[PDB]
Amino acid sequence: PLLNVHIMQGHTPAAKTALLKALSDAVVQSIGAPLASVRAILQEYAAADVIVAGEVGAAMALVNVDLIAGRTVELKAALILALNQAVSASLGMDGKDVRVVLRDIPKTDMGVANGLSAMAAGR
């Protein structure tokens, strides 16, 4: 799965390091994805650049997951839950302030190493 993570400015590099590791482990543990398929990249936002429920500057975290289609509803649920808890724990956040979005990508639509599709790679 390919994760892009969006957090508020203000956490330390060490805290953000632990978040990346915790998200990666959360993917491996919750759905059994091979470690080599797990990537996550992080971006920080100033409070002035976010709005939540009509309130500019309210805290949020967002984990977007592009992953190969075919996971059961139950594994998808485990993944959302594990990622939400990984963010809340790593950043000292309330889980109500975190959102996780899964985008099911068909195997013909997901690239892997050297520009082959996941279907081409026999995933």
Next chain:
Amino acid sequence: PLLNVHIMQGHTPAAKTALLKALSDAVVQSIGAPLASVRAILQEYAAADVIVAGEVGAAMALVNVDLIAGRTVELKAALILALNQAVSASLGMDGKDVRVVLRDIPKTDMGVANGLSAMAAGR
């Protein structure tokens, strides 16, 4: 709906604040989304970081919307139009330079507070 907005560098803080509020209002009023479900986060780009129709540095704005599946085509048209107008009015841009992308996320695939899925929470 979760919005990530991509705009050119150089706009005033007031205009970016007005943009975020106008985007949130556009979602609530065009599709009747619960206010608590509406989040938007903003990212700025240097001209050197964009290419449009082969022209490097062409001004653009982009609104990506991850929203729960099931809205009618009619509601999606109202949403796309309302978001385009929110960008155009807030930033003083031509609507031809703005793009809106809606990504339908099944209720099993959309996280809500505390890492339950939208389906789990009875949406």
Next chain:
Amino acid sequence: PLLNVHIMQGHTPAAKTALLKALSDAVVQSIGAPLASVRAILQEYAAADVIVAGEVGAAMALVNVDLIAGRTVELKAALILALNQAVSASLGMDGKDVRVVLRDIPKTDMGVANGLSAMAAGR
């Protein structure tokens, strides 16, 4: 097709211009998209903000493509391959460190100029 590209910090301005042009060319050449429909925007990441296969700071590149649904499996394979090669050639990267994700967007869900869906304007 609307591309958002994610690369590591530290590449030359010439390399990033070449990357934007090569990505645009790859889309036109591989699937026959009209040049006017092709946009790409670029974001750079610090080593501290990425994790790949559990390794914080491992170099990566990511090309996310939102495109109107309907392209065949073969055209998608050509696109994923061409985009991976545009990144690797432009940035001097190993193609194993690049990923491409395609997101099929129904015409009802893809905004075009002035807040109309691609269906309201017919793509």
